[PDB]
Design a protein around this ligand. Structure first.
Ligand code: NAD
Ligand code: NAD
Ligand code: UGA
Ligand code: UGA
Lengths: 299, 299
């Protein structure tokens, strides 16, 4: 069948559409923003909360649900919109998927469902989100699993908890994008806290490969899987690496930590290896170079 | 300080207000419905999503957050309102509690966050709700805990997962209330499925005692605690018990199971015993008699 991608104009979604089409799949792309300029492509422009979702899902066997408001920090002060985009739209989409007979829905969830854990975050750990954004992504994934559990549903859900994704095309509000502009263009970036916080930074090419594997693995019911590298790097170390790669001093200013940001993320990578055969291939130094090079050419 | 109860006009809230006042506490009651006809009582009428919550919280040290849309089954088809009442209102209340310097917030959560588990449901089990209602109660409790975790918050949260509460005043959409009307008044009740589903039915007097203990225990940070009996009884057994107690045949009709209802709940009761000194005192046969007697007098 054909594949539908929500959030297809965004950072991860646009890369996914490209790979799905390259692999021969007919893609239906849904987003309220325009798509950037072998399988066919139909662009459906509109809001998940306004579109006739059942109509959008005709002949669709697999849905990749990537649409969301994704920023951790604005979620404290924009909560109605985060609920509307991240939770209500998910419920409407899942109901439409039951009605349209979709077979598989892969939902983008987030490492922010774990909250503030030291060391390795495993899919059997209790979610303890520290931001309203993390709560909305937890609610979206739990809702998707509740729909898959209905006795009238013939669908399975793959809930993929991605870890801080970067690379060519990264959303411009994320740290690595801002730091690259602070280096190549001298546009200052604020470091929120002392920079010792850590992230498991995962390159978008590995995330898209994991998504493709969920489009293809044999059906074994629903699953919750971390998609990350298992290696965490500090903000200060990313700054140093960027200075080294470019021979330009990043324009940084240290400022106050932002409530809701967790101190460290690190994925347990074992379940995705077992279930999908997925292990991330790109480490940060290689990946950071890819993003710097893409950004240069983009400017 | 004074105590504020949201949802104070409802089933559990009205009993809580009575006990708080009887114990000498000044109570501020908030609900969008009118309250039923030693500590003082101020009735604040309005919607949590419209009121000036900081103003409502002046001089309030402890908040009991019981307002919600509580029905499991309508949540599939009323999801915007469940989000608005159960999640958005919770976020607004918690932000107001941080701004007003409230010290302790006790949040009514629900056994429906566990989903469909056999045997004993423990606070260390991963939540896997099977209804959109369960997702909204999970989101409300997780949000409350995220606010308590903020570095600027001087507040602790007690998230109490109640198990199927009954007794005098029970909401009329719940099974025991409907079954009592089907017995005392012959108004037929539909049994949803074959009646072999089980619940841990907890009497409201025990729930109010657990709530009072959370108003009083020494502060040891935030906690998630089941409030139940640890004994589950089937729907068919409740029917038989009601027939026995009354000498009237309940007017029942078996119908189709309702998607989203879990097959069994049973609380693990240990953590509330450890943390609060709470063990439920009322078993179902005694409690069912209390509710039947109250309903007779109420008719
Ligand atoms: N980027 C990361 O580091 C990361 C990590 C974990 C999870 N995620 C999750 O992955 C997904 C994709 O993230 P991204 O970085 O590509 O974000 P993005 O903002 O680039 O893409 C999301 C897209 O969703 C669209 N959208 C939002 N609300 C919509 C609505 N109501 N109707 C129609 N379209 C709507 C947006 O226009 C946007 O193009 C999100 O669900 C996000 O929560 C991202
Ligand atoms: N009754 C049970 O078996 C049970 C079990 C587990 C959890 N709970 C939870 O306990 C709490 C109380 O349950 P209950 O059975 O007493 O329900 P209830 O419906 O009797 O009381 C809830 C009250 O909240 C009010 N309310 C709802 N939305 C409001 C809003 N936006 N603003 C102001 N008031 C609002 C309602 O008018 C109502 O009086 C709920 O949070 C419920 O989810 C109940
Ligand atoms: O893993 C995840 O699930 C989340 O990863 C990222 O969230 P975040 O960790 O906030 O990513 P960045 O915005 O790139 O921030 C990374 C680190 O840099 C810090 N930061 C960010 C931005 C900035 O301008 N300055 C700065 O110091 C942040 O405090 C944080 O510690 C994505 O933005 C979320 O969409 C995603 O859900
Ligand atoms: O424990 C909880 O957290 C939940 O307990 C109850 O939810 P529920 O289990 O649905 O309670 P009832 O409505 O009293 O239903 C109990 C059983 O009776 C069945 N039932 C209910 C109503 C009815 O008319 N017929 C009927 O057979 C239900 O299928 C269910 O198995 C409360 O209604 C929720 O507010 C609460 O959050």
């Amino acid at each position: 069948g054909d594949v539908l991608v929500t959030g297809a104009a965004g950072f991860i979604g646009s890369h996914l559409v490209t790979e799905l089409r390259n692999s021969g799949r007919n893609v239906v792309a849904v987003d309220r923003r325009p798509l950037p300029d072998t399988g066919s492509l139909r662009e459906i422009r509109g809001d998940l909360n306004s579109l006739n979702l059942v109509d959008c899902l005709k002949n669709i066997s697999t849905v990749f649900h990537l649409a969301a408001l994704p920023g951790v920090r604005p979620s404290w002060t924009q909560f109605p919109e985060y609920l509307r985009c991240n939770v209500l739209a998910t419920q409407r989409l899942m109901e439409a998927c039951v009605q349209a007979g979709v077979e598989r829905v892969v939902v983008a969830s987030s490492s922010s469902v774990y909250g503030g854990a030291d060391g390795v975050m495993s899919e059997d750990d209790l979610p303890r989100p520290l931001s309203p954004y993390g709560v909305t992504k937890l609610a979206a994934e739990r809702l998707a699993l509740a729909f898959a559990a209905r006795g009238d549903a013939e669908l399975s859900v793959g809930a993929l908890r991605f870890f801080t994704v970067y690379g060519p095309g990264q959303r411009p509000d994320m740290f690595i994008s801002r730091l690259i502009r602070a280096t190549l263009r001298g546009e200052p970036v604020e470091i929120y806290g002392d920079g010792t916080q850590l992230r498991d930074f995962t390159h978008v090419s590995d995330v898209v490969r994991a998504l493709m594997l969920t489009a293809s693995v044999r059906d074994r019911g629903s699953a919750v899987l971390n998609i990350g590298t298992g290696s965490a790097v500090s903000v200060n170390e990313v700054v140093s690496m960027t200075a080294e790669l470019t021979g330009l001093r990043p324009c940084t200013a240290y400022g106050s930590a932002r409530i809701g940001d967790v101190r460290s993320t690190t994925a347990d990578v074992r379940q995705a290896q077992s279930v999908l055969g997925f292990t991330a291939r790109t480490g940060l130094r290689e990946g950071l170079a890819t993003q710097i090079e893409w950004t240069r050419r983009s400017l």
